[PDB]
Design a protein around this nucleic acid. Structure first.
Ligand SMILES: [Mg+2]
Ligand SMILES: [Mg+2]
Ligand SMILES: [Mg+2]
Ligand SMILES: [Mg+2]
Ligand SMILES: [Mg+2]
Ligand SMILES: [Mg+2]
Ligand SMILES: [Mg+2]
Ligand SMILES: [Mg+2]
Ligand SMILES: [Mg+2]
Ligand SMILES: [Mg+2]
Ligand SMILES: [Mg+2]
Ligand SMILES: [Mg+2]
Ligand SMILES: [Mg+2]
Ligand SMILES: [Mg+2]
Ligand SMILES: [Mg+2]
Ligand SMILES: [Mg+2]
Ligand SMILES: [Zn+2]
Ligand SMILES: [Zn+2]
Lengths: 212, 136, 103, 97, 101, 80, 25, 91
RNA sequence: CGCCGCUAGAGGUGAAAUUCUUGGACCGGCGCAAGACGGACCAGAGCGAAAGCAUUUGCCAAGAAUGUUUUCAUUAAUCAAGAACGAAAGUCGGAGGUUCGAAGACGAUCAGAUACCGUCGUAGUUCCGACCAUAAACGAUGCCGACCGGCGAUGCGGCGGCGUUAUUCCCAUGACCCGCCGGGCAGCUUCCGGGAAACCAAAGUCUUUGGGUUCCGGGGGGAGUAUGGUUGCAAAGCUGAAAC
């Protein structure tokens, strides 16, 4: 039979301003009557890790993509979500710390609404003898309110282009690190997960705007 | 056939899922999307004995068969995802993964970054073994 | 909301024993026509015709309106008597500031 | 008579500890009584790390570490060779090297 | 109409076809669950009190809430007299004689 | 042979309030020079309630568990 | 024989004798 | 004086139709014959009409309630879900 | 469950089989629905009278401790009878049924297995109303009050320290570090003494015997059994002897 001799190859184009627009090549069965090639390829997703997109950044902070459409034998993908790796997420979890969680829904400038998370670990100071390093839980509730509050006035006034440009240097984590030190010296605050739960419209014109 | 890419210097990537358990080892080759299975050879497809399909000797045969089919179908590099029975069973992988990684790295199949995407539950759902569980 | 609710109940406890107030719809009609009433208190489940009429009389006679979010049983409990009441009019608080703080 | 002052677990202030399932024989044991350790391995055995380093795409830019909460119970942990027996004067000891 | 209400809306006295003035879920204390709206091909899934999921149109109407009188089968009839009066009020459906007898 | 009849003042300061012999209170009365117009006010140290001057209507001492923290740096004296 | 199962078998004998008393009141 | 100790309102029947059935009918007979607080006039004049219908004596505002109580707890859960889906994301 | 791609096995073991599969199992990608569950962070840490209590946020009342030149003025400790909670399992109503799973059914080991191993699976395991009031309900150690060694620590308040680091900058809480005070979960040593010893700063201040008070033990069995009384829908719970 040899179905892979009949199968077709489409190359995947990442959206703009990461550094590049190359991901890989995927298999398409072929177009045959009802089963058009642009049917399942629109529903296919991708899950790619860095040091190839963000111009030599850290190896973690993975990205979840989804293919919007295809245009001239080149399937163009769009942002779907953002995760971190299992070894990084299970790492920096010490038995003698306090792990502070946060999560918030927020709508962007356009019709995209998202759900983003936040993780925080305690930090032992320089020349500290007490090995426990816990809190009073009132500062923990206050810092959950604070990290819920910061993400509102970033992501509410900014759509996908500006929030991806803010997630390029992890400026949200550095902003929480800067505004965090008055309460507690919290160690490597990341967002650890964000996923898209509602998508308004196809918007090929907005995809052309995303191209620029 | 030539397939994806001519004028070599650029790699064609594929996701290699390795599902290792205490009873069987799965090696599976997919594209970067996740739908199009390129090759899939289990332990029982290469070993006639049912008690030796979990052995690392099965992993060498299955991984060499999959690496031969991938070189026939023309894909260069692999991003290896590693997983085990992690829902309620032991989260550590079985004896097949230690041999499968070596057998993929031995005969071609340039390895990118390896990420252990293992299904970890939230808060320890109900275990199959019962109250006092496995005995001898 | 505990500050606002306990403040309103404490002001009612102080008007209960310090100042002079009237009780019932027919007596608050005479007080809102004579102009002695400064603040009126309506129940949650008062009927809409009586509520609109008392609000109309108050906004003609320059009288504040306060909608007490509560059944008339606990409004009678808040004014401190065993029966029920739907319409209050604080004509003269003793040492309270209901007619000073809210309007 | 008493064999231990702690009576096995570390429950001294509270009265109930949540049972957490074991790994080998899968028995629910309270977490202050069960053998709770944290194994840190390389994702590849060290005799096979060199083959992946020679046949890797990148020039040694990725080194993942596998972290697993290991949770045994004391009925199968002695068979699993972790919590070997000691002497009466040796039960007063601490974290082994 | 059920196209206006969001999913999960607990309604009753709904319609099979648009414009037959209420057919489904009319007994005392029963309701339907509205799910699975569709912009193209205007349909709507409803979970009926028997547990069946029926795909109906998106233009038919339904009153929001449950039918009053719920729990009517909580009390036993407790004697033959109340059963006689109940069935005399409803219809002659009670010559219930055993077919073996 | 500990000298319980004539102990050390530093030892009896480091002991608890009621363990010592005279059982003197650890609190005091401090004189706050309020910068409003002229008024100097005597006030208890462990001020449970707020302290408001009747002339300038400013907050003198914040209510705080333990002893009351102060406003802008008014002076204080110890009179026993 | 465990004290637990001795108690439960005497409990079963107690239930049997209770049913005997109910059988011949 | 406490004349009956277990039957309550069900003592009008007597020795017939079973202890468990009389115990299960007891609570709902107390529920159908008890007076309920009217949410409109504040009085306790909610008398039971035919099944599902409650009627207040003062101000004559007839309400459609449960078959044996004034409000079914499942119906209160339905009302909470309806107001949640109302003020959730503007229909 | 709906689709998509590949394919002959996938689960289950010391080893096989009972189970599902070209009618597409299993494996990977996406979506939906169901109910259970709050890991890692989680500790010889905290709270609660105990049983017990761990996702975020809001409301509702409650309480320990601390700081009190604040208030009353012996209002106090233990408790016959009586009463409030009370793990898990069990019983009676209403909703569903994810996982596990008494019984039950098979497939294996075994001379013999209905058990230990595996597959399916009822009651139950979930929530809302009531009953039952039991455990290795343990610290196998009643409550209140005083005294009798030290040390390193932890958590919760209070105090002191031109000590250290965080804002923009005096003004104030934040975090680390040092010491003290109050009760708490605790650990090491000890000839302070007890005890048969293990061991214990209480299980000590006991022949040099007496701070107050409640409940129970008199060799092992019979037996927590029988008969009575009493509670419970029932299973059963409480009190509970004698012969030998
Ligand atoms: Mg022993
Ligand atoms: Mg316990
Ligand atoms: Mg029924
Ligand atoms: Mg019949
Ligand atoms: Mg008949
Ligand atoms: Mg036993
Ligand atoms: Mg078949
Ligand atoms: Mg699947
Ligand atoms: Mg229970
Ligand atoms: Mg029944
Ligand atoms: Mg099963
Ligand atoms: Mg059996
Ligand atoms: Mg039964
Ligand atoms: Mg007992
Ligand atoms: Mg006691
Ligand atoms: Mg402190
Ligand atoms: Zn085990
Ligand atoms: Zn009425």
């Amino acid at each position: 039979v040899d179905p892979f001799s009949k199968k077709d190859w489409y190359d995947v184009k990442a959206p703009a301003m990461f550094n590049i627009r190359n991901i890989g090549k995927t298999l398409v069965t072929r177009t045959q009557g009802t089963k058009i090639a642009s049917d399942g390829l629109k529903g296919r997703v991708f899950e790619v890790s860095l040091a190839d997109l963000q111009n030599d950044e850290v190896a973690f902070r993975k990205f979840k993509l989804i293919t919007e459409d295809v245009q001239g034998k080149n399937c163009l993908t769009n942002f779907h979500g953002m995760d971190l790796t299992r070894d990084k997420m299970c790492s920096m979890v010490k038995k003698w710390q306090t792990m502070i969680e946060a999560h918030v829904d927020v709508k962007t400038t356009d019709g995209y609404l998202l759900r983003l998370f936040c993780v925080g670990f305690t930090k032992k100071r320089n020349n500290q003898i007490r090995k426990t390093s816990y809190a009073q839980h009132q500062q923990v509730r206050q810092i959950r309110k604070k990290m819920m509050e910061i993400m509102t006035r970033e992501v509410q006034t900014n759509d996908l282009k500006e929030v991806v440009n803010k997630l390029i240097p992890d400026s949200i984590g550095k902003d929480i690190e800067k505004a965090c030190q008055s309460i507690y010296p919290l160690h490597d605050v990341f967002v650890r997960k964000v996923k898209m739960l509602k998508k308004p419209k196809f918007e090929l014109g907005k995809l052309m705007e995303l191209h620029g | 056939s030539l397939g994806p890419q001519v004028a070599e210097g650029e790699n064609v990537f594929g996701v290699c899922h390795i599902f290792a358990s205490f009873n069987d080892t799965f090696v599976h080759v997919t594209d970067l999307s996740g739908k199009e299975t390129i090759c899939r050879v289990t332990g029982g497809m290469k070993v006639k004995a049912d008690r030796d399909e979990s052995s690392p000797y099965a992993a060498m045969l299955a991984a060499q068969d999959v690496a031969q089919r991938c070189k026939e179908l023309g894909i260069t590099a692999l991003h290896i995802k590693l997983r085990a029975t992690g829902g309620n069973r032991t989260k550590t992988p079985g004896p097949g993964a230690q041999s499968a990684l070596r057998a993929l790295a031995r005969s071609g199949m340039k390895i990118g970054r390896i990420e252990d995407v293992t299904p970890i539950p939230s808060d320890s759902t109900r275990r199959k073994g019962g109250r006092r569980g496995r005995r001898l | 909301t505990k500050k606002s609710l306990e403040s309103i109940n404490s002001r009612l406890q102080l008007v209960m024993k310090s100042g002079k107030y009237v009780l019932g719809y027919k007596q608050t009609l005479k007080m809102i026509r004579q102009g002695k009433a400064k603040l009126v208190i309506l129940a949650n489940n008062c009927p809409a015709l009586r509520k609109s009429e008392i609000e109309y009389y108050a906004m003609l006679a320059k009288t504040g309106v306060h909608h007490y979010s509560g059944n008339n049983i606990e409004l009678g409990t808040a004014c401190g008597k065993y029966y029920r009441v739907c319409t209050l009019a604080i004509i003269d608080p003793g040492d309270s500031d209901i007619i000073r703080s809210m309007p | 008579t008493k064999k231990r002052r702690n009576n096995g677990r570390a429950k001294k202030g509270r009265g109930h500890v949540q049972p957490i399932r074991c790994t080998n024989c899968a028995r629910c044991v309270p977490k202050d009584k069960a053998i709770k350790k944290f194994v840190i391995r390389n994702i590849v055995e060290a005799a096979a790390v060199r083959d992946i380093s020679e046949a890797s795409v990148f020039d040694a830019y990725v080194l993942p570490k596998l972290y697993v909460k290991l949770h045994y119970c004391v009925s199968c942990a002695i068979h699993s060779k972790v919590v070997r027996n000691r002497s009466r004067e040796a039960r007063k000891d601490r974290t082994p090297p | 109409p059920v196209g206006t209400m969001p999913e999960g809306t607990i309604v009753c006295c709904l319609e099979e076809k648009p414009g037959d003035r209420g057919k489904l879920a009319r007994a005392s204390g029963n309701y339907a669950t509205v799910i699975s709206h569709n912009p193209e091909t205007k349909k709507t899934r409803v979970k009926l009190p028997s547990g069946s999921k029926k795909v109906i149109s998106s233009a038919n109407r339904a009153v929001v809430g449950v039918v009053a009188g719920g729990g009517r089968i909580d009390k036993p009839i407790l004697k033959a007299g109340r059963a006689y009066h109940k069935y005399k009020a409803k219809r002659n459906c009670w010559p219930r004689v055993r077919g073996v007898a | 042979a500990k000298d319980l009849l004539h102990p050390s003042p530093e030892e009896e300061k480091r002991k608890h309030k009621k363990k010592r012999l005279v059982q003197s209170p650890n609190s005091y009365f401090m004189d706050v020079k309020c910068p409003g117009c002229y008024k100097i006010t005597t006030v208890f140290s462990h001020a449970q309630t707020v302290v408001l001057c009747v002339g300038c209507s400013t907050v003198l001492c914040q209510p705080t568990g333990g002893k009351a923290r102060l406003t802008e740096g008014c002076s204080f004296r110890r009179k026993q | 024989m465990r004290a637990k199962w001795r108690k439960k078998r005497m409990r079963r004998l107690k239930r049997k004798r209770r049913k005997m008393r109910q059988r011949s009141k | 004086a406490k004349r009956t100790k277990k039957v309550g309102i069900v003592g009008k029947y007597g020795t017939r139709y079973g202890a468990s059935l009389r115990k299960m009918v007891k609570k709902i007979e107390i529920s159908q014959h008890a007076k309920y607080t009217c949410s409109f006039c504040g009085k306790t004049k909610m008398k039971r009409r035919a099944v599902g219908i409650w009627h207040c004596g003062s101000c004559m505002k007839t309400v459609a309630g449960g078959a044996w109580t004034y409000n079914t707890t499942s119906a209160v859960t339905v009302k909470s879900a309806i107001r949640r889906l109302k003020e959730l994301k503007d229909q």
